[PDB]
């Protein structure tokens, strides 16, 4: 397993991957580890998939309830916090997750949660067996002054590298980005293949 | 034991064999692991016979009473997002059961749900001991422009090859069709019977 | 790791993967795992690479001294029978290994061994992770009558398969055929990349 | 594994299935269990393979040096009772084995030996997982008036019995009678095909 | 402990032996595992003797406070089916016990129920450390064609060739028939006692 | 298991049962558990057979090669001491027997050995599952003044009881009288059949 | 401890010692194991004595309560069946006791009871360290003929051989005779005296 | 700690941080990891100091006496050779070390060995906690073309990332470069000073 | 993890670092461990950050409460007490933290808490890995006398030696100063970088 | 316990406390840590007494021998190779110490080595409980320049810190300076003393 997120200038751009293990071994290719909870809000999800499926449909619920009463979205940084406090009221018999929340009430932001709760703010960050291969990459290509197309390029980069050196993370790569302008978009399947072709990444 | 669910391009198969090992040692050899619980949805059952069966007559009431309610069948994705709830609710005194429901709303899905309540969709699956054997199998041969008369075969040859290499699976094998036009419906054992011969699998 | 080892009329071929997991994550992508330890002999191995690569060398000077003394190449049984000697005496302390031996001494053998010592003929048989899933293209597609080529293509497409299914095991593939009147050949890389090409196993 | 040793007036029986389950699952359905280590001598084999080969090729040479030495072939009392001495004195380190002899030197013999090396003679005697099974139908069916065919008919029922029940027992039967005027004689499959066709267990 | 119950045309037998296992050492020789439990329903008691009794009772309490308020007797599968619901809801602090239920509704049914609540249906089954023993008799013995006096001799046999190899089982055999036209008979012993110096089981 | 050895005026009477259990069951009905080690001297084994077997073989070896050095059979009390000599020497690796050392040099004598090397006098002992329910009898109706057939007696109704309260005891009593003026005598089977039969035992 | 129960034709004979280990070693000499609860019924006591002494003022309250209610004495089996229930309440927390309870409703009855509240009826029956000696006594000796006297006689016998060989058993004996004519009768010290001169136990 | 080893057209490039731990904390800045052994053989060490720093010793004293008998440098696959040798004759009683070996004999040669002695050839391979960010930046930026210069960049970059996310890694970084042209050279401090600046990581 | 907290004559200075260490490795360099909790009140937060986060947020809660109730700032021993409650009453299922707690109600205070809810006063004080090395530096160099720039030099320092030795801390240095005239006052991180570069600490 | 010793241009300062804790508690004061054991060569102990007194006697004996052989004195680096030696010898039943070697062969050197034989270079260290409070004091105040008489005081400070906050450190200060002009030259305690009232640390 392997997700990334990435802030930049005006834009949050989350990517993951699709193998998942199940009874050991490659049992499915083309599972869901990127999820839209909000209209401006993204999270991506590593670790025991049950108890991660539910937290997703948990905020799912919690944050659409929460738009209907207070007539606007929840800020990204309350979104962590109430993710925070849930995790951390059942420490002891916790989810086996590790979370990341991207979005932009305001700026872009980039949320780090771990299974008791501790939310802390990145401007990137990477979670899964495949995440330290990912942060090599990050750390000596990223730039914080780098345009949305160039931010594609490099979380493409990132995973790829993972993939080969990372025998749980595999498949097809998905890639969200995230701007006011225009909100949550989901980058089809057919520009990321054309992506690695140009990229080089075969 | 060995399950196996695949899906085609309006129709839905699932088969399984019939040895159930209790005490140790072969004490049944036509054990029932393949359930119709509801009008264009079936599950399979591996693991624990007793937990198994009673997730069937759980599955059977509330799709029963889901129909009534709604006056429409439950979508096979709320099938399994309603069985996922259940097995997570009690992850620390679990279910020891691997699932797969398979059925058509609107198109063909086939869903496997582990003891966790991990659900994620997948063309075709395989569960129990013989369930690697069967992966072979359709690694190599599965398409999905197959009819439903090669899909029969292709089932059949896949638990025959499972049966040769698992000595937890045997008996004779259980395959039920679905489809819009003609519902739910199971095939007869001599047609089946006939089928081997003509396959050559004895 | 994957290997796998067929007879055939008059030939014997055998196929192993590349890919080495060390200290976890995929560390190596062309590992060896297929050598030649006699002029009709080959062994492939699974399991520790420490214990494997030793028991390589023991194999290579034993053969070679054998040769020397007797005038003659020790036979594919002879062989089994030695390396189930070494195995057994230091059961308490073993090799964590599990051995295909094949050759041509006047017939086609194919010989397995486990770390205990215990040695069996087959016609075909798989080690490794990625093993089951070989078992299931064999089951069904194998056949004594087939000629070289049509065997060199079932280990491809058999290997393929795991490859697929077992993250344990990837990279390319090594093909070596054993025949009396050729010797012990191994395939070029680029006729097995061809032959994938046409195989359709991309 | 599914062994059976009889006694008659003047012939002794014994009989094997080929079932080897190796890193667990069928890995190879025709092994060996069945060994004749003298003139009129036969041995069977239930356990781990490597030590049960060892112990094999011990007796052979042992056997046959005994014959050479004292111009007589080895009593099936003192082969038991030299096998008995081997096991008990590594006791603590045992062979993880349990084995038959049966021979004739002027009188039928049969002897069951454990890890520990006790060694106790009996008219007949059942081995491996699927041995109670065979005791059943031995407890109720075995006369020690019956004739040599008769006597055939018997072991070939009651492994096809265990088959039926153990999972760990399965593939074709082997068959070996042992007379003073005929010597140790393996009858032929297609013998013992016949008979079972002819018995009525398929 | 030796129970086994079998199917016939329109009948069901059920037979089960004496021995109790109390402190260790037989401290009874004449306990009692056949309880009748409707007017045509039987159940026989394999395991701890504390819970097997509490569970006798309580099928008895609802068998017939459900004759009374449904006029009508409750089906043989309907009985298996609430066992199976009782030892499931335990299944964390289980009933140490295996039971089997016969009886017939409209059809004879024997139901084989496990520890978890498993239940399943079967032609014959047995329970109890001699029932593999009683197997390996009904594997080669038993035919669905056999009148009631005949089921009678197969039960009395494969009970005493358990009564011979299992010491855990002993003592005086019990035996019931269950038809519609006589309902739930328990055959006397002068009757069994007679049979078995006829069958020549001493 | 159960032996006996009980002391008379001039006279020692020894007996045991011949059940043997091994990989748990009665695997054999007529084992033997009494052995002559000398002229006058005899001994009965109970626990594991292999070391058994070992012991009583070394005992007949030094028995003899001490009594053709010193032209005199070895005196009981110093057979006792030679066996807890050699039981000590190995007491952290030891032999899991219980043993019974009866015969007259110049009066009749009984040792009771354990697996330490324990070695004390008693005018009756036993040893074995069955040897509590055999001292219960002995308690209650041993008497020094009674004559050979009287003890005789006594010791195969000792027997008989132990058959009927220990699930590990059971088959045909064997029974062998020491004096000076007859030696060692077994006493044939039908005599004590005859016995038993006055005796009321069934 | 040793406890024993016996039945006649209209009597019921129970019997214990007296000697109780608390702390380890002999510290009460004179304790009390028969226990009075019925008109017609008694009970005996072994395990804890905490445990032991709560059930008796258990037993004595329901039985008092039942004959005031119900105008008639409670019958013996229900007096089992009661107790039965009790403990298997509790079995995961039980009461480390083993019962005995004898009486006559309309005959006589003993029933021996477990600590998991496994309820058998015998003719006789013993608990206790001390029991399996006690057995061996009644095997051989025991009749259904004999009169009172001679039950009072034989129960006396058993225990002074308990005595004998039980470190854990000691002390005076204790006898209570039931008749429907007499009652509930605990007999005399100064008789048992009088019977142990009689009978020759010292 | 960071080990890293590339090969290039006709180099060798090794690099390693200085960071030890002992005692836990960082107790020494300055230590050395990279160590020359023959006069175009490196060694980098990762693991416990101490196997380590022995291992060194041993193959300098063993590479220098093969140089002067056989008048030639020890091949590079014969270096890798000897150590897989040495550390798989003490597996059970191991070096806890992970080792890579770089040299010209004719050719660029990378080894990387395991505590277990498996040995195996790679263009580029890193060791230490630090490894898997420098994978993930030689994944993303290593290309077999580039010249000298650039290899060095390439792991001051590599290593530089490692110290950003491992907390065991830091320190001045030390870089060692071979040709046969130049030899062993170990670049200086000061032109590495230099390049870190020109490169950008401060 | 390093925090400090030193006492003045009229002020208190707070200062801690902001390396975060989850699932291992530095995933985040620039965590948040300094807090404002009241008007005149600071804590510093070292070990699980999903404990530490919410306990923050409860003292934010209770603290301004408590100062709209009472219209006063809690005093600083009050804070302090308030904490030890909470902390002690789920000692046996805690918060896994240590904290420090200070501020101006009259006089400067610094608090230092445990897990286990200990308070205890003191004039400086340091928590996590790092303290140690803070310590050595405060005990050599505090004084009570010291100005405020003095006392925020001697913070900075002590915490820059303890990231030199401890691999656990890391990143840029955050410093708060409480005075009653000024308030919580968060330097700002230009002049904590203006303040290293003039104490020479790089 | 607490060692220092740190390197200047022409000398080398090694400092130690006399604090021994023996069967718990402060049993002895006065200890003895700081060993001459050459002309210019000097070792401080910690840990256990037993291991560390014996390695001193050793390293006498072997470095006096080797002087005598050699003509010159043993070279630092040698002296800190041989003790890796030995330690490491018994890695897995080893000397329980951390030891510091100093002196001057041509240039001042310090080398701290661990348990396992672990040596290393550095041009200050410190071991013991009160380390970690040593490298605070010499992280911020240890510069290369200073004079003797300066690094005299700055040793007498960082143990006087440790003995404030180490409860295990304690005692007297002993003080060895080590010069080519002077040789190894002990500190008079008078001197010392004088410096601590200089110093202020009373």
Not at 159 to 168: E, L, M, P, V
């Amino acid at each position: 397993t392997t997700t990334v997120g990435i802030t930049l200038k005006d834009a949050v751009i989350m990517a993951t991957e699709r193998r998942v293990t199940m009874e050991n071994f490659i049992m499915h290719k083309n599972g869901k580890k990127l999820f839209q909870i909000d209209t401006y809000t993204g999270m991506t999800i590593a670790g025991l998939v049950g108890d991660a499926q539910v937290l997703v449909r948990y905020m799912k619920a919690e944050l659409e309830l929460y738009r209907l009463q207070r007539r606007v979205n929840m800020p990204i940084e309350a979104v962590a916090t109430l993710l925070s406090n849930m995790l951390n009221q059942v420490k002891y018999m916790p989810y086996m997750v590790q979370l990341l929340v991207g979005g932009i009430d305001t700026a872009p932001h980039v949320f780090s949660i771990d299974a008791a709760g501790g939310s802390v703010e990145d401007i990137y960050a990477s979670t899964g067996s495949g995440s330290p291969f990912v942060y090599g990459v990050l750390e000596s290509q990223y730039s914080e002054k780098m345009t949305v197309d160039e931010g594609v390029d490099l979380v493409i980069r990132a995973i790829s590298a993972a993939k080969q050196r990372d025998s749980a993370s595999g498949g097809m790569i998905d890639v969200a980005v995230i701007t006011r302008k225009d909100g949550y978009v989901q980058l089809p399947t057919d520009q990321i293949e054309s992506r690695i072709r140009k990229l080089g990444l075969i």
